[PDB]
Amino acid sequence: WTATSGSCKGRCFELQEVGPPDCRCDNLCKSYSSCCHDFDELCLKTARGWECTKDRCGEVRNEENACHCSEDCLSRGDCCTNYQVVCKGESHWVDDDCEEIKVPECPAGFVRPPLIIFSVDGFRASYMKKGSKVMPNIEKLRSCGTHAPYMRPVYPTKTFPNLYTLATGLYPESHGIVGNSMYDPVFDASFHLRGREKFNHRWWGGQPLWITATKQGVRAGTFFWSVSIPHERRILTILQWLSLPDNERPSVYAFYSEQPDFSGHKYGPFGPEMTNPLREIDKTVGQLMDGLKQLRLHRCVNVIFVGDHGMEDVTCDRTEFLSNYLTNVDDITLVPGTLGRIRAKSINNSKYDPKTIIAALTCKKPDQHFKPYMKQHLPKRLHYANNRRIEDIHLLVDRRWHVARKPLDVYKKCFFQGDHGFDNKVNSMQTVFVGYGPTFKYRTKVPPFENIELYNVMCDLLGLKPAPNNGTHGSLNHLLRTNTFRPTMPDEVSRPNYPGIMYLQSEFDLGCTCDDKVENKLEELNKRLHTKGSTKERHLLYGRPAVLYRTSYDILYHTDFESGYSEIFLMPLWTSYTISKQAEVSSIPEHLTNCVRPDVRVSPGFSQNCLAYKNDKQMSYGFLFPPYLSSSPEAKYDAFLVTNMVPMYPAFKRVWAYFQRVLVKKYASERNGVNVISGPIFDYNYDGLRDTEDEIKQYVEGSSIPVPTHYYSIITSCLDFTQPADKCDGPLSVSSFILPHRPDNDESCNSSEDESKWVEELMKMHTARVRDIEHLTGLDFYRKTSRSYSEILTLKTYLHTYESE
Numbered sequence: 001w002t003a004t005s006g007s008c009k010g011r012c013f014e015l016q017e018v019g020p021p022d023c024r025c026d027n028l029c030k031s032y033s034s035c036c037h038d039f040d041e042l043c044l045k046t047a048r049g050w051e052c053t054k055d056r057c058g059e060v061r062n063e064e065n066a067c068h069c070s071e072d073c074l075s076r077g078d079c080c081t082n083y084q085v086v087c088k089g090e091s092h093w094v095d096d097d098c099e100e101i102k103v104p105e106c107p108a109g110f111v112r113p114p115l116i117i118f119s120v121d122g123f124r125a126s127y128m129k130k131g132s133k134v135m136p137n138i139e140k141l142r143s144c145g146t147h148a149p150y151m152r153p154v155y156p157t158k159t160f161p162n163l164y165t166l167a168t169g170l171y172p173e174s175h176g177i178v179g180n181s182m183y184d185p186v187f188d189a190s191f192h193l194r195g196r197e198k199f200n201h202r203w204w205g206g207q208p209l210w211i212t213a214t215k216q217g218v219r220a221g222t223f224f225w226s227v228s229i230p231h232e233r234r235i236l237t238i239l240q241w242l243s244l245p246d247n248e249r250p251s252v253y254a255f256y257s258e259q260p261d262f263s264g265h266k267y268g269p270f271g272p273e274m275t276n277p278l279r280e281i282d283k284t285v286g287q288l289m290d291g292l293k294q295l296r297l298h299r300c301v302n303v304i305f306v307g308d309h310g311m312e313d314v315t316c317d318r319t320e321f322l323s324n325y326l327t328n329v330d331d332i333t334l335v336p337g338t339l340g341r342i343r344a345k346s347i348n349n350s351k352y353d354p355k356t357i358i359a360a361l362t363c364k365k366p367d368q369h370f371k372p373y374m375k376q377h378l379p380k381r382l383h384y385a386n387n388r389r390i391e392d393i394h395l396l397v398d399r400r401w402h403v404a405r406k407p408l409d410v411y412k413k414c415f416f417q418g419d420h421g422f423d424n425k426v427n428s429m430q431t432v433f434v435g436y437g438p439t440f441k442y443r444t445k446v447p448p449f450e451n452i453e454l455y456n457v458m459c460d461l462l463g464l465k466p467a468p469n470n471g472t473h474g475s476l477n478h479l480l481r482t483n484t485f486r487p488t489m490p491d492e493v494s495r496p497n498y499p500g501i502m503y504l505q506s507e508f509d510l511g512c513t514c515d516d517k518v519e520n521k522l523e524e525l526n527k528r529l530h531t532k533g534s535t536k537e538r539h540l541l542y543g544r545p546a547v548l549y550r551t552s553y554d555i556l557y558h559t560d561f562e563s564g565y566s567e568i569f570l571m572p573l574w575t576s577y578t579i580s581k582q583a584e585v586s587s588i589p590e591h592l593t594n595c596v597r598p599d600v601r602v603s604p605g606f607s608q609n610c611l612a613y614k615n616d617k618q619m620s621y622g623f624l625f626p627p628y629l630s631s632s633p634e635a636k637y638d639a640f641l642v643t644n645m646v647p648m649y650p651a652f653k654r655v656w657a658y659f660q661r662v663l664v665k666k667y668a669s670e671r672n673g674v675n676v677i678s679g680p681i682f683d684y685n686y687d688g689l690r691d692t693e694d695e696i697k698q699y700v701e702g703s704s705i706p707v708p709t710h711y712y713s714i715i716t717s718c719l720d721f722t723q724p725a726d727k728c729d730g731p732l733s734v735s736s737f738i739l740p741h742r743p744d745n746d747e748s749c750n751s752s753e754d755e756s757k758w759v760e761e762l763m764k765m766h767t768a769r770v771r772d773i774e775h776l777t778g779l780d781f782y783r784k785t786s787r788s789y790s791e792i793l794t795l796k797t798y799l800h801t802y803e804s805e
């Protein structure tokens with residue numbers, strides 16, 4: 001109950017709330033059905049529209065008007081945004097030349113440049129080029145400020161997950177807004193776009209920017225605007241708040257437009273009907289900038305123009321129906337559309353089997369436009385699993401398609417020509433970023449980056465300490481003229497041991513054999529130097545990775561590779577090697593096919609054993625440094641050390657062997673050498689973070705050898721590919737992957753074919769950032785380069801997406 005007969009007299013768009021049953025006048029009252037009786041009359045004035053005309057200039061104030069053209073309006077802070085232009089011979093901001101904003105130029109009493117976040121729904125990245133002729137204000141912000149060619153959203157590429165990621169710096173799995181529809185089984189409660197449960201604060205985790213600011217003494221304008229409040233009124237409200245006295249005035253503001261998304265759903269991303277919504281957004285930007293210029297704030301405020309996601313062509317006829325795959329289709333609940341999430345209709349029904357649902361959805365039709373996954377098997381780059389609100393069964397839907405349960409759901413519910421929500425690597429889902437202001441750089445293009453990074457930057461713009469988040473603070477310092485965050489490398493927690501030769505061959509009873517008794521003083525001193533690290537400059541190009549947790553490990557040097565070997569996990573944490581453009585691929589000779597050799601530097605008790613692998617009928621083994629790339633027949637023996645062995649399912653060995661035999665060499669040829677760091681990952685609880693040993697759910701049968709959930713590789717070369725990877729003077733180029741360690745290749749529908757037809761496609765799907773690997777391993781890479789640490793942070797956040805232009 002709200003007794004709505006109090007008044008909004010003087011309280012219109014009040015910043016601080018008042019608690020029911022007092023009536024409210026803030027821009028959320030509409031949504032609660034709790035506005036005071038006179039809210040529309042007082043707060044939503046519309047009389048005479050939004051623009052001054054010549055006949056209104058110097059009028060007598062009439063408090064009924066939507067905005068004012070009277071002499072006193074500037075000091076009241078409520079002029080129409082074009083007042084100075086119509087009535088005082090001023091230019092619109094868009095007609096003025098770009099002039100570098102070297103320092104903030106602010107009215108007295110401003111303690112810091114305000115931040116205005118101008119968010120646009122569905123604003124696909126290519127609109128910046130394709131709509132350029134009709135968006136002059138946006139194009140000025142873009143060319144004069146700092147911009148990226150695009151900004152990557154989070155998955156799913158829906159509105160609330162992305163807006164709340166913008167506000168928190170968190171992945172959806174962590175902030176808890178995991179889709180536009182949700183069931184939380186702890187609360188036994190559902191979240192929907194329509195209605196009122198979506199306003200309960202227990203849905204929304206982490207710490208959004210307005211809370212961060214408020215806790216640290218910085219005042220915030222509202223971020224949420226009710227749909228009924230017209231755009232012109234949102235802009236006027238921001239401009240009025242900017243005229244408040246110093247102790248009352250917010251420092252951070254947001255605007256939101258439901259366009260161009262609204263129209264894109266109806267007409268597709270490039271429907272002829274889309275020109276008009278783009279024009280109208282630009283006009284709104286023009287209103288804001290003219291308004292700021294009138295208030296002498298246009299060289300004081302930092303403006304961010306940012307989208308939540310793009311928009312793809314999607315029609316009703318491109319719908320896959322689960323009724324064409326499953327016969328039990330009424331025993332499930334599907335969250336449908338551009339992604340799929342499946343759970344049991346009833347938790348009382350113990351007949352429901354996820355394995356058989358997954359199998360009935362796997363590679364069943366020749367051009368099947370969705371792929372089923374257990375959530376823990378989704379590409380780690382999506383970071384879409386560690387939340388009880390994410391159902392175990394997930395369907396990744398091809399761009400341009402939908403999934404639905406039954407045909408009845410599509411025509412008893414064609415309407416739409418656009419949608420979004422797909423994999424965040426998809427070109428059509430990419431969105432925009434421009435930063436314009438004293439704190440941003442002038443006329444500067446920056447590379448594409450992920451929206452999870454912006455929270456830290458907005459905190460930097462406001463002098464705030466960010467709450468813990470998934471950004472990598474410092475990776476976006478290159479956007480900024482000043483306020484840069486000066487990060488430092490994390491301290492190494494565990495130092496390595498450097499073991500020498502300590503064990504005789506006969507102390508090992510590993511059940512391994514090798515055909516290797518083949519007896520020189522030139523080449524005796526030679527091999528000793530290699531085992532003491534003589535080639536380490538060649539194979540370890542960026543320093544050893546730092547171990548950021550407490551553990552016991554050994555550095556092991558070899559002619560062709562260096563490794564950090566874990567005494568706890570009985571395998572390397574990391575293995576590092578460099579393959580030049582000129583390197584030759586060789587075969588594993590017949591006599592060495594099953595060769596495994598004890599490592600006389602590492603005790604029997606801290607070694608793997610061959611008998612376990614023999615006994616484990618499901619599990620085989622591979623090698624981290626590939627025997628195929630040995631520098632010489634004699635060096636090849638090092639590759640068969642028991643300390644280079646890792647557990648691998650035979651199905652996975654098909655993937656790994658093709659990577660190592662064909663792909664590494666291809667990359668070295670294409671990139672002019674590569675440095676490779678490879679290793680295991682253990683993420684049995686799918687939290688994106690390195691497992692402790694007591695979290696491991698699977699071991700090689702009858703042993704303490706833990707089974708990885710994934711294998712990674714980080715492949716680094718010179719960005720200037722005229723220089724070889726091992727003699728690079730300037731910036732680096734990286735691609736990485738985190739491959740799931742699976743006992744079948746069910747994910748790859750073409751896997752019965754030769755590896756040249758499906759392996760590289762799988763590796764692309766599981767593309768990763770170095771930072772993703774860092775989280776999953778507790779390692780810190782690139783510790784010793786000639787590059788600035790901020791540049792290295794940017795490198796560590798890079799994702800190679802394998803989409804065309």
Ligand SMILES: *[C@@H]1O[C@H](CO)[C@@H](O[C@@H]2O[C@H](CO)[C@@H](O[C@@H]3O[C@H](CO[C@H]4O[C@H](CO)[C@@H](O)[C@H](O[C@H]5O[C@H](CO)[C@@H](O)[C@H](O)[C@@H]5O[C@H]5O[C@H](CO)[C@@H](O)[C@H](O)[C@@H]5O)[C@@H]4O)[C@@H](O)[C@H](O[C@H]4O[C@H](CO)[C@@H](O)[C@H](O)[C@@H]4O[C@H]4O[C@H](CO)[C@@H](O)[C@H](O)[C@@H]4O)[C@@H]3O)[C@H](O)[C@H]2NC(C)=O)[C@H](O)[C@H]1NC(C)=O
Nearest residue numbers: 173174175176204205206386387388468469470687688775
């Ligand atoms: C991306 O960035 C984020 C942010 O930095 C990273 O997430 C953090 O990761 C930490 C490790 O996983 C995690 O720390 C744990 O927090 C527990 C207390 O947490 C509460 O308070 C914080 C702070 O205010 C709050 O933010 C949390 O909010 C979560 O939960 C509510 C729902 O209840 C949601 O509204 C919200 O969205 C958020 O959910 C997300 O995180 C939780 C985990 O907290 C997930 O379950 C959800 O799925 C969702 O993703 C909390 O309200 C604290 O109790 C933990 O301590 C245990 O573990 C330590 C090990 O050091 C042990 O020593 C302790 O004693 C304790 O163990 C005991 O409890 C165990 C669990 O019951 C029990 O099994 C044991 O036997 C012991 O008795 C722990 O410190 C931190 O909370 C989150 N923060 C957020 C915001 O998610 C994320 O990792 C980054 N991602 C990547 C890929 O890098």
Ligand SMILES: Cc1cc(OCc2cc(C(=O)N3CC[C@]4(CCOC4)C3)[nH]n2)c(C(C)(C)C)cc1C#N
Nearest residue numbers: 117119159163164166167223224225226227254256
């Ligand atoms: C900049 C910013 C804005 C923002 O919200 C702006 C907003 C969204 C809506 C709204 O009405 N929506 C959204 C979904 C929809 C549209 C079509 O139909 C469903 C209704 N209104 N205002 C938020 C949140 C976290 C408050 C959402 C965070 C940030 C940040 N950082």
Ligand SMILES: [Ca+2]
Nearest residue numbers: 121122159308
């Ligand atoms: Ca949206």
Ligand SMILES: [Ca+2]
Nearest residue numbers: 683689690691
């Ligand atoms: Ca984990």
Ligand SMILES: [Cl-]
Nearest residue numbers: 158179180181
């Ligand atoms: Cl959803």
Ligand SMILES: [Cl-]
Nearest residue numbers: 210222223224
């Ligand atoms: Cl708000």
Ligand SMILES: [K+]
Nearest residue numbers: 613616619620
């Ligand atoms: K085996």
Ligand code: NA
Nearest residue numbers: 745746748751
């Ligand atoms: Na297959």
Ligand SMILES: [Zn+2]
Nearest residue numbers: 122261265420
């Ligand atoms: Zn939409």
